[PDB]
Design a protein around this ligand. Structure first.
Ligand SMILES: Nc1ncnc2c1ncn2[C@@H]1O[C@H](COP(=O)(O)OP(=O)(O)OP(=O)(O)O)[C@@H](O)[C@H]1O
Ligand SMILES: Nc1ncnc2c1ncn2[C@@H]1O[C@H](COP(=O)(O)OP(=O)(O)OP(=O)(O)O)[C@@H](O)[C@H]1O
Ligand SMILES: [Mg+2]
Lengths: 762, 791
DNA sequence: AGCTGCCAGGCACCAGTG
DNA sequence: ACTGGTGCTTGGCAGCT
């Protein structure tokens, strides 16, 4: 079997599936990696059943592996960043291709969603912004230049693809990009003067094209992302705020789990994009708020109708690629059938943005009518066997079908005729591939078959025969069906030619429907969850009245205690003191989440919110735990990131810095960090701490005040109160907890004596 | 909902529903000819779990019956999927003969496949024990029992409290856990796999005693050392009933039960076990564990045994000296013994299948292969001067007769199953050989008939063949078929060929199949007979496999000791630990650079060490290697050090600092309530409160209690410099630290333990190393000099 | 070597004579 | 009450290409 080997040499860096009967089999290393990735026997050879290959392809692709199929020649390849088949994608997750490269001036980065055609480029200012973008976009497949210096950024990621340096040449990029978009220059996309980014996108587009060997007419635009356009959040922050993913890798108990009740998969994905990239331009935000408010009373009637639109976005991709299947057209039709109802319901809404979405949504009455006449109500999965084109659409087809039915009705009458004649009740006509049509009689009656019957196949308990009057009509049936089938196929490909001219307007429509779904959803969440519209002020500041954690309040069956916050250039840092279980962390995270939601355009969980501009959010809240430096090391590294990068427009949340080292070292560090944040950086800061010594800071510097949480001892337990009050904590509860936990009474008494001794010299 | 009373059901469903009523909560594979079928909700569930098609069976009266099923010859693949998901499955077979049965043939559930009850090679993992366990509790404590169905090993214990019980669950890691319906502490078992709620009556003491005595063939349990332990007996009683219920045959390999007493082993709490990464690393994997380094056994039963020793260190001085002696004596015979031991394989699990009467042909083959290694092992070991080695050499036995039997009765390389014959070799039984002669006359005859008839008729396409559906035949092409003799009886028609039969061929066929059936039945009768001949020696055979496995462990431990440069530890009368040049057995293998060996001196005068040093300076490692060295000494193994003198240890406790604080405090409370002068306590950065000093205050109070009242051997790593003052105040406490060097803007970690407290805490240096701006560090150093001037 | 479809062996179900 | 045909799972492989 040197055929497999020599054929593997073609794509050596890609897993090779080799058709062997009703299975695909991998050999050698390929068998290895495959077994430990899919959990199957490493009998070296491994394999998977032909009827489940798409399942295993989805898994491999999900783990960043490209896969070449073979049936003997490489007839198909799938790469993680360029798949478009529904079976291989996850409904509610974006699947991106990206390219990264480094210049002497900085980084170049680009991403592509091969289904929607959403194409973005950027030029991250440094290793830190780059890391945040990599984490935010989370590409399924990453193209990188060989000479990539700072490999620490991408090493460890799945789907890494090393590419030759010549693939990142700008002259070639501009040309290829201009040709793809059909323009002479890129000025209209606002990227004409962004070479690094362009080099990344040029490489990406070429890879995509090579992977598809098809035109990509749905990729008609590209957009540049600027640092100042969005609130910046690093991986740790992004992780610690649990936006779309909890700290345990799951999806429950995240912000998305409470905010994302969209009715469409494209809506869901778009909402997740918004959550991860809050915008800083209040014009956009004011527009989103207005819409949220205007849509309120229309939510109930709009959602069930929007639900029927489905994932038009991804279907449209298969239309552009010419791989759409009968039920894709059926769903597109069904989606077109909702447009007039959506138009009529949106007509009354007093909102310029809603009216624009309403126009952008379109109608497509012609395409609607076409698919109504061309395809049957509930077509099969594939066109392969026909039965997709409805009767009455084409005259020829209608005829061939009438002949086949006629020849079929004859053979049915032939059966009843041959029965009464021969008088053999077991007699019937059946069809098969090997023998085509045939006549069957049971064994016990077979000896009475007419002499003109020719014997073709004996079964355990029956004989099958043929006669000329049989093979005659078999031809009438087979030749007819065959033509009908060929016709259906041609009529089906014709549907593509009639639909594709409107591709651009169809893409705008799906885009609009996706945005409506997002906005209608946020309108329903605000009204349902008692949110309020925040207002924007000129200078940095946050004023919350009765704010809540939007996730914790929906999960716990205990009353959530709402809390105020007042931060301004005059009251810039709060030293938060008190218990562990008291509510410090929650209180800090809800501040960040409220800021985030305000900068997505959504209403927020409070009675009132006034908030200034915010360039970035830092949350050093929660835990260390790495392969893993050490808790204190990590905690200090994240602190260093905040002190090097925060500005006066930053929101900073710090959670008991100092734990994990000596008392004096830890106290000295916390004091110094807090002083630098307050007097030099001047960022709006929530500084949680266990050090009572830090509560003297407000008497040493302006812009710093003490707030705290307290507890209540009652019965045989402790009730950690969750109300933030002014001033410093005056109690500690560590000994009380130790007593409840069963620490022997003698030890507690000795610890009490030691505590007072320690706290007094202070 | 149609009213589904008995009489409204067909005879099939009356029989089925009645059987299903005996296994209401588990899947029932129902034998229906060539398929095992499931119905109603079982069909829907099976459809989902096995990815098979959900169909239906029509009904004259009522709703159609949801149906699913698989070919009987493919059950083992489907059982695998089920058992790997924790599903039990009852296997119902046809008992009667349909030909002589009026209505439905008699059916019976002959076995229940469950996660902790499997014995088939295809369902188990070679190097992992698969245990069935049963648990229960009353007001004073817990009853617990375990059984390895593939070895007969039956154990009972009575964990005194919750942590002990939790530690035991973790140590034994049962694949199936039976628990009494009134269990109060569900937190102990809530998350486990194969959890099985059981009725209270299955834990009745009188019934347990009666059933255990019946199973062991005794009048009382005095001889097994468990007459005294009714709380454990209740659990074993539940367990044995479950085991008999799942196998539904005798279990002659379960001939004994042993009690595991506290005093007999070093009791390790859960945090200790998970923090020393004995067989599972902290990330749940098998990489870089104690076992990954020490387990180079060559037999699967040996690998299992070694992991059992690692988790259960023994406190019997005698056992320990004997193991050491063996390890020292055999050190030179390693290379010669291992290749031969490897060939004995997993005789333990094969013997279980023998006992269960499920052993397949290749099990007897491997058993035979194992018997053929004994003479060489006997020879290799006679020289080795060591009483314990000769005791093992004897226990191992030889079984010459049994070896010869299997050599005479089974072919060199038999097939996977007995079902289709070809297992019993020729010369073993004359009747069998005779019946086979007929079945093997096949091709001289068949070819002879073909030629003869081809020449006589002159039809060159003529051929003789066989078909399972239609039988033997003479084939002539459609073209020349019209020229066949009129004597030829038409049997089967094909598209381009015609098949016929003649009396001669029919007659040959009628005897080739009856004799084939005769041969196959005799083969199966003689295969069963092998069991009857082997079983009487089951007891001596189990002793043999047990000795073979212990030999594999000790031979392996001897090779590790030599290869990894270990030394033999000695034991002292009083609690204490004296290590010269000690290393962490795992860390020193993974780490790509020399490991810095360190000493340790613990005694009743020097019983608590306060350990300081910078982050990443080696604190946790130093503590962990102390525990591992102790652990390794108490399995009878040599140790990673230049020298080690160690006293008695009853328990090892661990507390690794980092809701929480509620758990940290609960656990430290457990330590203070249960540690003794013979305990080894490892406190890693404990004491964490809500303010500056409450946590430190508690760690201080805790340390004082450990030093002054309990007097246990304690290693107390901390970053609280305040605690370096303890030695001044308390007898028995001393300072040690991990050395670090600060040269300009860098910090080097020496990794070596020195006496006294560290010169300084390196928090600020470590923070500067983490990238914290120099301006901040400069402010912090200023703040620090204010604080340092208070005293 | 690559598709199709008969068969395996339980029991019940049904239409056609008693 | 008989007789003789139908159906239903999935794996194996005859029978045709
Ligand atoms: N405002 C609130 N109302 C009701 N419950 C709350 C509130 N805040 C917090 N909780 C509950 O209290 C629990 C503990 O809160 P949290 O982790 O924030 O305490 P903390 O010890 O003050 O934080 P840290 O010490 O980590 O800075 C949370 O799990 C949450 O369920
Ligand atoms: N004796 C030793 N020889 C060589 N390397 C060592 C030694 N002890 C520890 N190391 C290495 O140094 C690292 C840090 O050790 P350890 O985790 O015990 O430090 P630590 O003092 O517990 O502080 P932290 O908890 O901050 O890591 C370990 O990963 C280990 O690889
Ligand atoms: Mg440590």
């Amino acid at each position: 079997m040197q055929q497999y080997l020599r054929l593997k040499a073609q794509h050596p860096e890609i897993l090779l599936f080799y058709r062997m009967g009703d299975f695909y089999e991998l050999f050698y290393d390929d068998a290895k990696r495959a077994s430990q990735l899919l959990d199957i026997s490493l009998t070296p050879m491994a394999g998977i059943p032909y009827h489940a290959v798409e399942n295993y392809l989805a898994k491999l692709v999900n783990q960043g592996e490209s896969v070449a199929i073979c049936e003997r020649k490489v007839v198909r390849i799938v790469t993680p960043g360029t798949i478009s088949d529904e079976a291989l994608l996850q409904e509610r997750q974006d699947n991106l291709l990206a390219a990264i490269w480094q210049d002497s001036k900085g980084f170049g980065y680009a991403t592509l969603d091969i289904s929607s055609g959403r194409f973005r480029l950027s030029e991250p200012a440094d290793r830190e912004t780059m890391a945040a973008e990599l984490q935010r976009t989370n590409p399924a497949e990453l193209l990188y230049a060989e000479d990539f210096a700072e490999m620490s950024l991408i090493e460890g990621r799945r789907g890494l693809r090393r590419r030759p340096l010549w693939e990142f040449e700008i002259d070639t990029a501009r040309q290829q990009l201009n040709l793809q978009f059909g323009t002479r220059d890129l000025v209209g996309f606002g990227v004409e003067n962004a070479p690094r980014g362009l080099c990344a996108a040029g490489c990406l587009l070429q890879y995509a094209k090579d992977t598809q060997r098809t035109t990509l007419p749905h990729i008609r635009s590209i957009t540049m992302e600027r640092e100042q356009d969005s609130i910046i959040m690093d991986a740790a922050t992004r992780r610690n705020l649990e936006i779309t993913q909890n700290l345990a890798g799951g999806a429950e108990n995240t912000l998305a789990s409470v905010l994302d009740c969209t009715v469409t998969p494209m809506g869901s994905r778009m909402l997740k994009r918004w959550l991860h990239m809050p915008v800083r331009d209040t014009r956009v935000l004011l527009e989103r708020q207005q819409t949220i408010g205007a849509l309120q009373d229309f939510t109930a009637g709009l959602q069930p109708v929007l639900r029927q639109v489905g994932d038009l976005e991804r279907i449209l991709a298969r239309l552009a690629l010419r791989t759409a299947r009968p039920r894709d057209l059926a769903r597109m039709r069904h989606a077109f059938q909702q447009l007039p109802e959506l138009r009529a319901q949106l007509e009354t809404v007093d909102s310029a943005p809603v009216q624009a979405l309403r126009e952008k949504m379109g109608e497509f009455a012609e395409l609607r009518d076409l698919l109504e006449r061309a395809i049957i109500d509930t077509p099969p999965v594939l066109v392969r066997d026909g039965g997709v084109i409805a009767s009455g659409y084409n005259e020829e087809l209608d005829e061939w079908r009438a002949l086949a039915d006629g020849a079929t009705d004859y053979l049915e009458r032939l059966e009843v005729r041959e029965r009464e004649r021969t008088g053999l009740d077991t007699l019937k006509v059946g069809f098969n591939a090997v023998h085509g049509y045939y006549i069957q009689i049971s064994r016990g009656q077979s000896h009475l078959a007419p002499i003109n019957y020719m014997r073709r196949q004996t079964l355990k308990n029956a004989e099958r025969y043929i006669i000329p009057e049989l093979k005659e009509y078999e031809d009438k049936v087979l030749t007819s069906k065959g033509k009908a089938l060929a016709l259906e196929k041609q009529l089906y490909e014709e549907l593509f030619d009639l639909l594709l001219p409107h591709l651009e307007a169809l893409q705008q429509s799906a885009s609009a429907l996706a945005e409506l779904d997002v906005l209608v959803n946020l309108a329903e969440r605000a009204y349902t969850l008692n949110y309020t519209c925040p207002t924007f002020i000129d200078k940095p500041g946050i004023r919350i009245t009765e704010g809540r954690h939007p996730v914790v309040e929906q999960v716990l069956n205990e009353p959530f205690i709402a809390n105020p916050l007042n931060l301004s250039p005059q009251r810039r840092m709060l030293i938060i003191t008190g218990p562990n279980m008291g509510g410090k962390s929650t209180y800090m995270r809800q501040t960040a989440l409220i800021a985030l939601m305000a900068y997505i355009g959504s209403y927020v969980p409070a009675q009132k919110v006034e908030i200034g501009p915010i360039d970035r959010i830092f949350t050093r809240v929660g835990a260390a735990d790495d392969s893993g430096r050490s808790t204190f090391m990590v905690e200090m590294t994240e602190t260093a990131n905040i002190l090097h990068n925060a500005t006066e427009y930053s929101l900073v949340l710090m959670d008991e810095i100092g734990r994990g080292t000596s008392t004096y070292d830890g106290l000295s560090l916390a004091w110094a960090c807090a002083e630098n944040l307050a007097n030099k950086i001047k960022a709006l800061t929530l500084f949680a701490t266990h050090y009572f010594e830090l509560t003297q800071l407000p008497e040493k510097m302006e812009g710093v005040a003490n707030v705290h949480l307290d507890a209540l001892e009652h019965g045989d337990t402790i009730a950690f109160m969750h109300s933030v009050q002014d001033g410093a904590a005056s109690k500690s509860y560590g000994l009380a907890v130790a007593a409840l936990a069963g620490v022997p009474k003698e030890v507690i008494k000795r610890a009490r004596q030691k505590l007072r001794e320690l706290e007094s010299i202070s």
